[PDB]
Subunit: 226 residues, 4 copies
Amino acid sequence: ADTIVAVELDTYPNPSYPHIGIDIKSVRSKKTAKWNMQNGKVGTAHIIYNSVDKRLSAVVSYPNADSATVSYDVDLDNVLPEWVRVGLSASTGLYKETNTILSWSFTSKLKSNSTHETNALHFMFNQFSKDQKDLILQGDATTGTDGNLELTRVQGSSVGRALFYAPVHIWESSAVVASFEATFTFLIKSPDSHPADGIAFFISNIDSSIPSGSTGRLLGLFPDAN
Amino acid sequence: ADTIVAVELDTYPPSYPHIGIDIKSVRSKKTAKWNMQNGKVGTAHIIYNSVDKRLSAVVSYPNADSATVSYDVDLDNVLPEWVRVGLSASTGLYKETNTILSWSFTSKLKSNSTHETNALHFMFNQFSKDQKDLILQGDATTGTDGNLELTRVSSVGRALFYAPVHIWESSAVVASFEATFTFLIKSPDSHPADGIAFFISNIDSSIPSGSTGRLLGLFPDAN
Amino acid sequence: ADTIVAVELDTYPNPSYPHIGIDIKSVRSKKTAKWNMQNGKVGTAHIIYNSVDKRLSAVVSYPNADSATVSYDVDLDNVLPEWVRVGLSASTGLYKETNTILSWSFTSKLKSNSTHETNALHFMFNQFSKDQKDLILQGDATTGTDGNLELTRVQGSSVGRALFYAPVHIWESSAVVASFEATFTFLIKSPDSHPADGIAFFISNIDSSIPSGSTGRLLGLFPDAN
Amino acid sequence: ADTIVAVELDTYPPSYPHIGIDIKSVRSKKTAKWNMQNGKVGTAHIIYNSVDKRLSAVVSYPNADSATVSYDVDLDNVLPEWVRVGLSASTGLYKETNTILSWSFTSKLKSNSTHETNALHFMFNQFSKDQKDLILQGDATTGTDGNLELTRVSSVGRALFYAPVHIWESSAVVASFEATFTFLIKSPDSHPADGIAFFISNIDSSIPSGSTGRLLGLFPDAN
Ligand SMILES: [Mn+2]
Ligand SMILES: [Mn+2]
Ligand SMILES: [Mn+2]
Ligand SMILES: [Mn+2]
Ligand SMILES: [Mn+2]
Ligand SMILES: [Mn+2]
Ligand SMILES: [Mn+2]
Ligand SMILES: [Mn+2]
């Protein structure tokens, strides 16, 4: 299977409450935190990591609201391949709901032992268009809808994904400090008062694709909840 | 053929080394005298913005001269909406190298609405053996000293960034890009025929047949 | 007097219409363009310059609207001192109105002839606070009001200014390419249908202060319309 | 006294050269063994973010070792809201230099609302004679090779950035900073007593009386 490191936001029953979690190759989060999923409101996720601290951290917030944060000491050099692809995933249950990404930005940096040796990548979407050639859209994912990214069909069990086209060089054996930082504003709107949903920022192998039966709780990242 | 907009640095015998702006033709739309310094590391600065509709480049060497060349052009009319950026190089009958020590790019689409910036930005300061985010064409290679060797070390090589770039948009108030790269042309011969170039092309541009020498690996014919 | 290079947006009668203009040491713009001042709506100004082109350019736009642009070939090396301070200015006439700056960002870069020799400065305000120590507030200018910058009193003839604390190194004799880029979102709200107002992004000597009698058409930048 | 948070690199005889994190005291809260390489250019990387509340530094030399030292600390409780950042240095009885070749900083305040980022970012790659955006204290100077000479070329010098920095805010979901600088300590003596440090202090911090030698120009007494 694919190598997945993710930061999911799910409201599925399958802890008995909405949470934010850090998944290292398994849907069974290595660490979680209570999340107050606010239907209709726009939320913001901040994911960060640096090779010095070897600590992955995320923070989800809503305006005038709470903020769920979850960290996990992990050396991605041991988990992920050298070259990866980053993305966003989403899955819907039996509920009518949307997983709209309003914005998305990423920054990766490899700093070598030598002088002025920085290597970086940085994309920043604040408006998706109909023909977004720099995004690999998988599943029921689409663009252009209000200049937004619709991960799940805009709905009865839907799984969508959107990874950036260019492969990302997460780590290097010669780097003194490698680090990344992602951010995205979402909006989960559902008519139902308590929908089962799930978004996630994931890092995977350059050729990761939706596993068969990765629906619902599997977030489109895992083929089974092993 | 492919749609090419380039900023070349050639020493192929106007009757002298120059820096030029090519719009779909190897016959530069505008040039400037360039003092090609063999062995020394040079720096190219290419810039453009939709407001000014003026493409400009500046090549310099440390403690040296600086050739600059600008050209009023609306790339919205020349280039497709989605492109791929890159570096090209070709050698003549001479023993020489076209080593890219560094390369960075920045593209920005600013919409009419509030806080609506879209951007892309890569920065190579050290190329590795397996550079998956670069499409290497021709005799181009990586890892050699953590550098990019465009030509074989009559050679022709290319290196384009993997992700397609969104140069323009009909809804943007201001689109702009900025590239920079440090080169080093070393040749045993005192007066070699060489040529590097920063080019913007269609996402699927490939080395045209017979685009050797003066054609810079960008054009199939000068006519 | 002070050395002023500015990009003003005025609706004063004193051409016979609202315009956007480039001022080089004189209130009498060196170049202007028709501006459709939209009362109540938030506008965005984009000012840019680079030593290669020696061309100053500005672009003002409103959402779903028009866009006034004005350029002017000028070598700031000959006009401005090496070290300057950047800022925003505003003045009100006999009208009740506001000059609210919602955001402001600047980027200055000095690139030398040598390798990897970039020098830069970059600030970005998206929310002003009550105690904004990194801003020199002159005139009736204030902060904190909604986390915004109120240039003119929030009004019967008011002149305010706000310059960044750190001096900016615009040019250098040893640089191959110097360049700057500023952006700011404004909002001019007036009860009157046709108010006389004026905002401006200005570059001046590190110790520039509101000239005596620089009210109204003088934009708080010039002591007299010479 | 002033409020000082610093990341020092001293060779003043623990009984060996080290890299340390000082929170209001010269007696480091955490240290690590540092192989001070005389003559060679080193690079310090200091980072911090409000989520992790962990200050970390990493010092390296080309083709060399790398000393790293981290310390869990909430700067919201230590530092004032508005500060000034800088570099400090002190020499012992030895003939030596404390040359800063480059220096860059980035501070970011991200609010709970949408697209609410506030940032500051300076980047010196070449200091000039009249560097108006730097507050030079002590024997500190600029222009020498387009470099920053902290100590006299028992010296003590400092260089803080002019604009006050807004480290934290009560309304921010995530605040963070990142500094980097390349130094070069050259000494004729094989084992000199020296010390550089990146420090964060109150906007009006000045060299304390008798903050020489081991005190790094930051503290008036070690007690
Ligand atoms: Mn879960
Ligand atoms: Mn590892
Ligand atoms: Mn030519
Ligand atoms: Mn056009
Ligand atoms: Mn006017
Ligand atoms: Mn000049
Ligand atoms: Mn110590
Ligand atoms: Mn605190």
